[PDB]
Design a binder for this molecule. Structure first.
Ligand SMILES: [Co+2]
Ligand SMILES: [Co+2]
Lengths: 450, 450, 450
């Protein structure tokens, strides 16, 4: 049968001490609630009902492109009330899974087991075994079904020793949700309508509640503050790193690796300590990334070595290229195969052709550079003090001498040679050598301090 | 009643294999003994008696400004002898707490509980529960008082199973200390006068000894070598990071964060992995610090982003500024609001006005730069080969073309424009455009190798 | 008696998902098998028989200089078959230790205990206690000898509770190995000749098998995939860091320190977080290394401070020098005592004399620089567009003004002074001042946008 999800995401998250609402805080570069939405989607959810409230405008701007039903809750009166806000949209004969936007680590695999265990007209309840279950509702099993969830202060001596507890995550059909939610009351110390009470109501109707245990405790773990969030981050990063290691990526230290997006990789990739991968990154076979590198939205070809402390964004690098150390590629940098970019070099919105080298203390911006060029140390592309900036076009087999300024717009044709210390404002023709004629004064017998 | 402290700090620390004495080795940038002095002061200590000996000259130079009574011990004959060196200065009716300079993690909160538990004319003894208490003196409690501290080799079978042990940290009134210290002997295998024996002497006088358990084991942990010191460092850094997380600072990985001083922060601050905060640092609301940054003695305004691998010291940065990546601010750097400092840029002892940008491969030193200036790539402030160095003064709305040298002392007035590749030695007037007239030789048909 | 080793190293290592064979994957910069070879050599092995097969050509190129007997196995038929490939070369009256090339952490100390415990005409078997020994052969001890190794599916209830298990590492005399290996069969579910069966065969001959327990579990741990390899790496790095800490090296965080080679150190060395030491590195007394540094094959003198994010290779640095931050020393960099190298500076194959400074945005390559020189910001050594590159020779007490290009081959004699913005192509004489005569056009009333 079909499936839809409800995600509870209305909380202020006071103990985050933030202007953001609770579920917008990020794990691996992505809001907690976005993790849950994505999981619901890969589970096969037809509709995803997002219960939101606090920080509503921020939720709407930060999640504008998410395919969810925006259910704006005016007041928080308990989890049953929150789920009931979406209840009018439940199809009678689809399953509904209830998830929490501040519990981002829940896996598709666990939720698939949960849905499959759900008996007809009944509930599947996600539980978890804790070593210290103090404070949480204990799962009472008579034969093989959950007959009760006994809270801390109601439990007798032997019931407090039960380690299995309620997570609040559950699956039931839409018609059953509509029926039981309307029968939840608020006669308790908190004065709230608890979704937990559906287990009691199901047992009242002689409907079966089956428990499905979560594999990992951290899977169902939420974050009420940033310390707890940091713990989820580290668990998540360790799981990601472990997956990549088993796929054949050499990560020198998985505790010093961060992925905040997606990584496609070839074979024999080596990633040294303290590397951050952000956005969508693709690495070819035998790519080596040195320590300290940051790669955001990049494609790197086979056999590329990126040396330490290089920062690359929105860039493409061809096979057998060598980058770094201390290299910076800014958006629009496109390096061809067998190129060389060296220390204290910045390349922005420029193409660099096969075999070309740019190895020291250089800025290349808004440029096209051909194949087998030699861009000397200290070379800078610049503009006049005008309005918009303009392009520098360098052909193939050009030598640009050290500490030369290329003043756009300008064109340097194939095979040209430019001396060191030159200011190029006029176009340079094919096989044209341009050298600066300097005037110097020479003073003999100039004694420096002694 | 009043309080004074005695800090034992005379040890050579042989297993540190150092020219420094034991207690000068740092935790979080601060000598171990300095942590203990500070804790004693915040506890409300009127006097702090520092028992020192080995590396005496180094102690005096490294702790010159500490408000302590310098008690120079000529020989180490045991802890009771060390405390007795300060005994003549004890007021009869003040409390005295004994602390160890190689145990820097002891908290004010635990010591407050210790002092409060001290019965009149008696002792409060700090104890700790260990899982393996082998080697340490076991606490024997008859009813609710410590009647004995039984060492390892004296204990019977059931006494060795006692987990509570002696830390050596204790509180008693000054008159009681004077009395009992004079009655400590050295008839034991080590031939030393042990402060531990005060518990036996108190029980001899029908005075009560009460045990107060330490909350954390690491709290009372000492360091005899650098491996143990590293363990204290990591515990300390984790506690600091956890405090900041609960206060609402997003620290991506608290295991890769170091604070060596103090941090004042606003809300929604984000600190990426491998950041070091040193000295006194203040961060405004919504400050983002990228990976690899080092901030020492800096003030950063609201909404500033510092991008990866930026190093800042003794600097101020105004609101909405953007720094990095690979930016270096040296002492005296003062950046106004909405400024931009980019990769491979070094700013030393200079003010930079609102909206100005210095984005590539540039050194600005001993300079004043006004508002809305454009400092081109490759610009360098420099001096003549003389004696002292001098200042470069740039006004508002000045354009400095790429790869220009500004030769101090020089003044560039408001609205001036300087072409790329210029050497500025003479003052530039208001709305003056200065462009370099280059001489070039152009040789056609210059064939590069083929 | 004499000793030789056999190292099993023929595996494909399929779950590494690599073009390399299993044992060539590195720990601490060194192939796993190289760790085992080195350990065998320091144990005093006369011969080391390397059983290899998969990735044979890669094994031969990567381990070309290793002093081993290359035993090429054509098919993997079990560990007994592998050891038997080397059996013809065993001396009858030498001991033989069998080691695994994918278990690199085995220590000389444990193997020395193993060899010493071996009874005449018998076997010494290395065992290990696991908390969960499921899947491994249990050690059965009748009195004080191993009478059997009972596999998982043969063991009765009480035998499964035995924690001591077989590692496969063993020592016996060469004649005994020749005898028993010829009697190993393959009648088991896998159809393989197991070295494990030697224990049964020894007991058949009324020869004693003695168990020697490994001290650390990780010591005998192998790596079948890169996740397991990463675990070995971290264990290894932690052991190395702990050794250095106990020797008196201050490592701020031993979990963020990597040694991939050897480190000789003096006293009072301080190494901040995220430092990588590669190849052979020697540090003098009181060397301080800042965060993020990479040192490969370097010698650093007493009292040198290397500031953050400096990368040094194949370089020598004299006493009291100051390097960094953001400094790069490339192979052949030789800095004398009391030198200064600063941010965004690259030095390649150059000598720099005592007291000289090169503090900003500079490339010095293929150069000799004398004592007490001042190399200004933006200075670049460069070449003509020719064939080979050439040398820049600068004498003592030379001032090179900012943004000057030195065009090799060129010589600047003692005491010379060069103005900023100069292009030096001709030799400069002793006490010669060279200043560039610039031509500038000055346009008054040039109004920039408003
Ligand atoms: Co220039
Ligand atoms: Co320049």
């Amino acid at each position: 049968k079909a499936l839809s999800a409800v995600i509870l995401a209305a909380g202020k998250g006071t103990r985050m001490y933030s202007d953001l609402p609770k579920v917008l805080h990020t794990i691996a570069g992505k809001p907690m609630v976005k993790h849950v939405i994505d999981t619901a989607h890969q589970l096969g959810s037809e509709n995803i009902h997002l219960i939101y409230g606090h920080g509503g405008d921020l939720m709407r701007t930060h999640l504008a492109n998410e395919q969810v039903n925006w259910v704006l809750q005016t007041e928080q009166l308990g989890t049953a009330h929150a789920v009931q806000q979406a209840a009018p949209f439940f199809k009678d004969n689809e399953n509904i899974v209830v998830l929490y936007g501040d519990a981002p680590l829940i896996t598709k695999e666990t939720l698939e087991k949960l849905i499959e265990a759900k008996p007809e007209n009944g509930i599947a309840l996600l539980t978890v075994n804790l070593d210290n279950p103090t404070g949480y509702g204990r799962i009472i099993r008579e034969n093989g079904n959950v007959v009760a969830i006994v809270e801390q202060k109601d439990a007798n001596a032997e019931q407090l020793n039960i380690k299995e507890v309620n997570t609040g995550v559950m699956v039931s059909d839409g018609a059953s949700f509509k029926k039981w939610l309307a029968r939840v009351g608020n006669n308790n110390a908190q004065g709230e309508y608890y979704l937990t009470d559906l287990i009691a109501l199901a047992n009242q109707d002689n409907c079966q509640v089956v428990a499905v245990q979560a594999t990992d405790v951290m899977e169902v773990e939420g974050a009420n503050n940033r310390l707890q969030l940091a713990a989820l981050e580290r668990y998540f990063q360790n799981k990601q790193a472990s997956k990549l290691l088993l796929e054949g990526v050499m990560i020198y230290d998985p505790a010093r690796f961060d992925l905040r997006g997606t990584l496609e990789h070839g074979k024999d990739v080596e990633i040294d300590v303290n590397v951050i991968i952000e956005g969508n990154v693709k690495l070819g076979d035998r790519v080596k990334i040195g320590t300290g590198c940051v790669l955001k939205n990049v494609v790197i070809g086979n056999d590329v070595e990126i040396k330490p402390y290089s920062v690359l964004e929105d860039s493409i690098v061809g096979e057998k290229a060598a980058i770094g150390p201390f290299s910076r590629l800014r958006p629009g940098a496109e390096l061809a195969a067998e190129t060389h970019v060296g220390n204290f070099v910045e390349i922005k919105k420029s193409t660099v052709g096969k075999g070309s080298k740019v190895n020291h203390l250089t800025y290349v911006g808004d440029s096209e550079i051909g194949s087998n060029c030699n861009i000397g140390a200290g070379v800078i592309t610049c503009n006049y003090d005008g309005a918009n900036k303009f392009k520098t076009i360098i052909g193939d087999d050009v030598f640009v001498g050290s500490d030369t300024q290329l003043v756009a717009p300008v064109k340097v044709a194939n095979g040209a040679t430019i001396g060191a210390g030159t200011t190029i404002t006029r176009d340079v023709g094919e096989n044209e050598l341009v050298i600066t004629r300097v005037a110097q004064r020479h003073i003999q017998g100039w004694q420096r301090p002694i």
